[PDB]
Amino acid sequence: AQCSVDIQGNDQMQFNTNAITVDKSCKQFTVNLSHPGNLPKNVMGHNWVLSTAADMQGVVTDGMASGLDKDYLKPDDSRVIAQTKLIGSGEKDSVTFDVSKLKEGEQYMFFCTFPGHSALMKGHLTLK
Amino acid sequence: AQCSVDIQGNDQMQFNTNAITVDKSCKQFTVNLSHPGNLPKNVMGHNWVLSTAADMQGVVTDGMASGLDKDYLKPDDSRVIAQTKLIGSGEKDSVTFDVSKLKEGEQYMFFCTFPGHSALMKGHLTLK
Ligand SMILES: [Cu+2]
Ligand SMILES: [Cu+2]
Numbered sequence: 001a002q003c004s005v006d007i008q009g010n011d012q013m014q015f016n017t018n019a020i021t022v023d024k025s026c027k028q029f030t031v032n033l034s035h036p037g038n039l040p041k042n043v044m045g046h047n048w049v050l051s052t053a054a055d056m057q058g059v060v061t062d063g064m065a066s067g068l069d070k071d072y073l074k075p076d077d078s079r080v081i082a083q084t085k086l087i088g089s090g091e092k093d094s095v096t097f098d099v100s101k102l103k104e105g106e107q108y109m110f111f112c113t114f115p116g117h118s119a120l121m122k123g124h125l126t127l128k
Numbered sequence: 129a130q131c132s133v134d135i136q137g138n139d140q141m142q143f144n145t146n147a148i149t150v151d152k153s154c155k156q157f158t159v160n161l162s163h164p165g166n167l168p169k170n171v172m173g174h175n176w177v178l179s180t181a182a183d184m185q186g187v188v189t190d191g192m193a194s195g196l197d198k199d200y201l202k203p204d205d206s207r208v209i210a211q212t213k214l215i216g217s218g219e220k221d222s223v224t225f226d227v228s229k230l231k232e233g234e235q236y237m238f239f240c241t242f243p244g245h246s247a248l249m250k251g252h253l254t255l256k
Binding site (some may be wrong): 011013039042043060064077114115117 | 242
């Protein structure tokens with residue numbers, strides 16, 4: 001099986017995919033995020049964050065108010081299933097999470113929580 | 129004479145200036161906003177909005193809740209000294225306001241109210 005995905009967030013404020021399917025046969029799933037652009041974190045930072053679709057907007061909004069030093073995420077936010085750190089040009093980061101934290105039937109979203117980025121940098125995740 | 133400024137908002141969520149000076153010998157001041165770049169206003173819209181620094185955060189927050197169809201600005205907002213409409217790539221808008229609206233002993237800020245954008249898209253405007 002394939003229990004991981006490789007994703008890029010670039011200088012044009014885009015992810016290079018908008019759809020991830022997590023095989024039910026996986027015990028854990030891994031996201032490897034990279035930044036092939038030239039701009040630094042404080043002006044084009046990207047992270048990869050996972051939540052219910054219903055929870056995305058709250059997570060995005062409290063993330064902005066938490067600020068850059070908190071990688072634009074509410075500390076210990078109950079809504080966040082999994083997250084990478086915030087990265088800039090030429091950096092990379094991975095995160096692994098337990099597939100047990102998901103629920104067949106629920107709708108999940110992945111997104112970047114850098115202010116304004118989720119209007120473009122978002123997509124759907126679902127178990128297969 | 130010079131009582132105007134040309135401002136851009138681009139696809140990287142930046143204004144091309146973060147400080148605007150008004151000459152006190154102007155009766156009126158005009159801002160010409162443009163959007164170079166190719167993303168449309170529903171994912172990268174920009175406006176130019178002016179308030180006291182103390183009121184910016186309330187204008188921005190009420191703006192997000194007003195939504196896209198109201199240019200992310202609360203209708204009849206007494207806190208707003210001047211505003212453009214929300215524009216996308218290839219579009220333009222201008223706004224003119226009375227310099228008499230800028231008072232003694234107040235500090236003013238300009239910003240975009242599209243969700244998240246004011247984190248980078250903000251600046252100071254001063255009368256001298
Ligand atoms: Cu981002
Ligand atoms: Cu904007």
